[PDB]
Design an enzyme around this catalytic site. Structure first.
Site, PDB file in Angstrom:
ATOM      1  N   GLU A 136      31.093  40.419  43.700  1.00  0.00           N
ATOM      2  CA  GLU A 136      31.262  40.201  42.376  1.00  0.00           C
ATOM      3  C   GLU A 136      30.507  40.901  41.168  1.00  0.00           C
ATOM      4  OE1 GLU A 136      33.624  38.491  41.686  1.00  0.00           O
ATOM      5  OE2 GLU A 136      33.537  37.125  43.341  1.00  0.00           O
ATOM      6  N   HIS A 141      38.463  34.990  48.469  1.00  0.00           N
ATOM      7  CA  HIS A 141      36.915  34.223  47.227  1.00  0.00           C
ATOM      8  C   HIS A 141      37.517  32.312  47.577  1.00  0.00           C
ATOM      9  CE1 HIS A 141      34.369  37.586  46.175  1.00  0.00           C
ATOM     10  NE2 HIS A 141      34.878  37.568  47.244  1.00  0.00           N
ATOM     11  N   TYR A 145      34.858  48.561  37.558  1.00  0.00           N
ATOM     12  CA  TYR A 145      35.417  48.454  36.016  1.00  0.00           C
ATOM     13  C   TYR A 145      34.995  50.204  35.262  1.00  0.00           C
ATOM     14  CZ  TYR A 145      37.657  43.714  37.630  1.00  0.00           C
ATOM     15  OH  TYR A 145      38.034  43.228  38.054  1.00  0.00           O
ATOM     16  N   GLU A 165      38.835  38.111  46.346  1.00  0.00           N
ATOM     17  CA  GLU A 165      39.197  37.568  45.394  1.00  0.00           C
ATOM     18  C   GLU A 165      40.369  36.794  46.086  1.00  0.00           C
ATOM     19  OE1 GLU A 165      37.737  36.499  43.651  1.00  0.00           O
ATOM     20  OE2 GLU A 165      36.384  38.125  43.366  1.00  0.00           O
TER      21      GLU A 165
HETATM   22 FE   FE2 Z   1      35.704  35.590  43.711  1.00  0.00          FE
HETATM   23 FE   FE2 Z   2      35.871  38.901  41.802  1.00  0.00          FE
END
Ligand code: FE2
Ligand code: FE2
Ligand code: FE2
Ligand code: FE2
Lengths: 287, 287
Positions: free
Chosen positions: B93, B198, B100, B195
């Site tokens: 994460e 995840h 970004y 993700e």
């Molecule tokens: Fe995540």
């Molecule tokens: Fe993420």
């Protein structure tokens, strides 16, 4: 709510640590250990037992550092870039722990590995020291913590990272510096390269918080750290007698223990407690 | 006290997810983004602003998933292998959030980046949804949590991963599937590849805990999930109106939102809530 912004420094150091942490990234898949069988099979009974035991011990300590220590310290920091570094460190604890299983899978039978883990879960000394360290972490399981609590959790973390592992690390390094179990030795060196920077980073954070304590809290924390040090030392002397008496290395490991405890102290900006001796050159060679 | 032992399965899936998580490992340094400048300059100001904004939004959510979500859920799992996987996710994460910034550093001036993070920190809709999610996580900041509390923190986690990001992801994908900002687009695709897994992993965990709840706790958790879903939705619809009205894409993004919300539900083994609708093939092409 703030999002992390890496184009604006929150401090003087987290970026450099983030970079170094990720530059050191590794996984167990990248070291084949099977070539270690040839030296493994020529070690005595007593030497195999000591190795398996110490690895079993290290596995536990990394389990806890990744599952409690890093996560609980990071959740309370307000420095978001410092936070990021700790979360990466935490993941790497899990790589470390996993890498010991990678070593066992190649050296030991399924039944020998069940054996080691039964011994580690039932071990009174491993329980005590892990229990002591983990007691400081578990205080952080509440919404708001004091700076004295956070500081002491960080002291325990550096003790763990820079001090408690090394009664264990000693033996893979002793064997490797004799050309034995070198593939496994490379793994322990990768682990140690990580821990060295872990210890330094958490120690920098501890020192920032120390500066935010009142004079009287500063004195309390100093006392408690010193006590904690000696409490742990006593237990490491028991541990080391247990493990290494069979192979005649007790005093060598003990010197190493003291040496590493001083590095732990130093990472926290404290004075060394033990007088420096010559560390066994064969472990140095394995380093 | 137990050490993680990967030679004895604690479940049917953690090993495969650990392997896939580490096989997908990346950092921002692997993607040069400067080639994006050429397409960037050709976008309207409304298009640039919409991109910067959504990216700012994503940064926040990843900041919170890495600094609160993953750590707080992982500390209360007893499955040590599952715990490992979450800790790796948590670190990732942080990679995502940092990525970004890597994109901003290329596409925006220092003063333009201060602008976007000001807007993020002051945003009342980002504050609400991040606030809602994070309220379930902060519930875990105590020594013992109930299975209902843990389950809901896992529901919020999946909602965050599989649902709340996608009003943001939409636009980098839309632009990439047209050959614009394609280097940035590769980064988002790496993020989205993470993700997806995840969301699937946290959802498997949630379903295990759901099975451990009494029939009456099962009914409560169902009522609360459905309410949380709708609470979030009304916020996302406000968010999407704000961001995308300037470039005419409100309804497209809304269809994508609902689609991804159904994926979130499915990952939790629940039934879809929204009627299925044609998603924009241009975003699918950017995927
Ligand atoms: Fe995540
Ligand atoms: Fe993420
Ligand atoms: Fe470690
Ligand atoms: Fe460490």
């Amino acid at each position: 709510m703030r999002a992390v912004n890496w184009n604006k420094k929150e401090d003087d150091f987290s970026l450099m640590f983030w970079k170094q942490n990720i530059a050191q990234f590794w996984t167990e898949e990248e070291i084949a250990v099977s070539s270690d069988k040839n030296t493994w099979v020529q070690l005595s009974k007593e030497e195999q037992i000591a190795y398996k035991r110490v690895l079993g011990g290290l596995t536990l300590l990394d389990t806890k550092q990744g599952g409690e220590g890093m996560p609980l310290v990071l959740v309370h920091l307000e420095n978001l870039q410092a936070k990021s570094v700790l979360a990466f460190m935490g993941a790497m604890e899990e790589v470390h722990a996993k890498s010991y299983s990678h070593i066992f899978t190649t050296l030991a039978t399924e039944e020998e590995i069940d054996d080691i883990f039964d011994w580690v879960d039932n071990h009174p000394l491993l329980e005590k020291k892990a229990g002591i360290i983990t007691s400081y972490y578990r205080r952080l399981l509440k919404p708001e913590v004091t700076k004295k609590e956070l500081y002491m959790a960080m002291v325990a973390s550096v003790f763990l990272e820079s001090y408690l592992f090394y009664s264990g690390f000693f033996y893979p390094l002793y064997l490797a510096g004799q050309g034995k179990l070198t593939a496994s030795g490379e793994i322990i060196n990768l682990i140690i390269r990580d821990e060295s920077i872990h210890g330094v980073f958490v120690g920098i954070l501890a020192q920032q918080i120390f500066a935010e304590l009142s004079a009287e809290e500063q004195q309390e924390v100093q006392k408690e750290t010193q006590e904690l040090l000696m409490e742990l030392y006593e237990i490491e002397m028991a541990y080391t007698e247990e493990i290494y008496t069979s192979i005649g290395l007790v005093e060598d490991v003990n010197r190493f223990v003291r040496y590493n405890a001083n590095k732990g102290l130093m990472n926290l900006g404290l004075e060394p407690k033990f007088e420096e001796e010559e560390i066994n050159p064969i472990v140095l060679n394995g380093l």
